Structure 1
Amino acid sequence: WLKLIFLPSILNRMYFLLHAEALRKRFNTYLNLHLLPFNGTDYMPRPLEIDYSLKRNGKVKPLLILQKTVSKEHITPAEQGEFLAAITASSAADVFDMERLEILGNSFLKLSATLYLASKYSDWNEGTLTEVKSKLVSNRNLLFCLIDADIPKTLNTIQFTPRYTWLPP
């Protein structure tokens, strides 16, 4: 009885854990990184980590992201828990959310859109480049280009209230 008390939470978490695993395998396959020993059949998913930052919980140090960008020896496997955190929205009152990854993702998206536009339309004034960049990274464009990827059907965005708004398997 005591073990079964926790069953709804475990089932709800395994739902989105399987969703995140599917996303992880799909993205690793798209980048041809699925054949790596880390991401192959020998993948050991690391345990989920609590985000304690959440409210309800001389010399320059080299930057890690660039260091693994220029060298493949420091490429780390894309964690399943990280993908679950990306899926889980803040509205779902879970122990992790999507905001911290969203900051880095938004900055990278802005940088990449800027570089792409500057390389594609180097003969434009900065007003139109800024306008086009704002349109590209706008909420509507991201919404549409994620809806056409069948991602929003697997998001975790509602609070878990099993007795009220949940359908058991």
Structure 2
Amino acid sequence: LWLKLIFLPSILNRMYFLLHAEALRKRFNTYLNLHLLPFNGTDYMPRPLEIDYSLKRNGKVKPLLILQKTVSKEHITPAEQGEFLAAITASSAADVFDMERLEILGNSFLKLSATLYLASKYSDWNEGTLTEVKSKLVSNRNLLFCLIDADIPKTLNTIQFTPRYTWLPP
């Protein structure tokens, strides 16, 4: 029991942010009306977290997966709780995963979506002002404000776990 209690603070600190990730997962699934699916309903089976081994301290064209599941719904996969936890966990928290790899795809999608939205909305503008407005939309300040007003930064995992020094037990 002493050996098992040695690991207790780490387990509790992971459970904290796993519960935050579950909250985010359920909230986003419900907002998309996808919460009634067999995958995402009461029968959700969370897959175990996966080690991101890329981290430093750890004839024919193949169809693209995201586009494959964009047009056909049979390839839709449940949004994993571990994936949301990785999205929340910053690199400063010296955990075994971070938000870096997801951020690349998220940034690319945000840029593409803002570009198409502005092009469809303001089709009678020159390229210069469209580029400027897009740079404003995807700027750090805009994303910062529009995530602060979503009450997300109160649930982020961004500090290294030093239980003895900067941690308050339950």
Separation (CA, whole Å) in 2 of partners of 1:159 and 1:97: 12
CA distance in 2, matches of 1:167, 1:37: 39
Runs of 4+ aligned residues of structure 1 deviating over 6 Å after TM superposition are none
Aligned-pair distance for 1:71?
0.4
Shift of 1:76: 0.1
**CA RMSD of superposed structures (Å):** 0.2
Structure 1, residues 128-165: CA drift from partner, whole Å, max 9, x if none?
00000000000000000000000000000000000000
Matched with 1:131 is: 132
How far is the alpha carbon of 1:49 from its aligned partner? 0.1
Number of residue-to-residue matches in the alignment: 169
Query: What do the CA deviations read for 1:39-91 (whole angstroms, capped 9, x no partner)?
Result: 00000000000000000000000000000000000000000000000000000
Whole-angstrom CA distance in 2 between matches of 1:16 and 1:167 = 15
Aligned mates of 2:118, 2:100 — CA distance in 1: 26
Deviations 1:97-151 (A, max 9, x none): 0000000000000000000000000000000000000000000000000000000
| In 1, Cα distance between equivalents of 2:94 and 2:169 | 19
Looking at structure 1, the residues matched to 135 and 169 of structure 2 have their Cα atoms a distance apart, in angstroms, of 43
Looking at structure 1, the residues matched to 154 and 118 of structure 2 have their Cα atoms a distance apart, in angstroms, of 31
Q: Secondary structure at the match of 2:118?
A: helix
Taking the aligned partners of 2:4 and 2:131, their CA distance within structure 1 comes to 56
- Cα distance in 1 for partners of 2:168, 2:82 equals 24
- Partners of 1:128 and 1:68 in 2: how far apart? 34
Structure 1 residue 4 displacement after superposition:
0.4
Provide the identity percentage: 100
Aligned to 1:72: 73
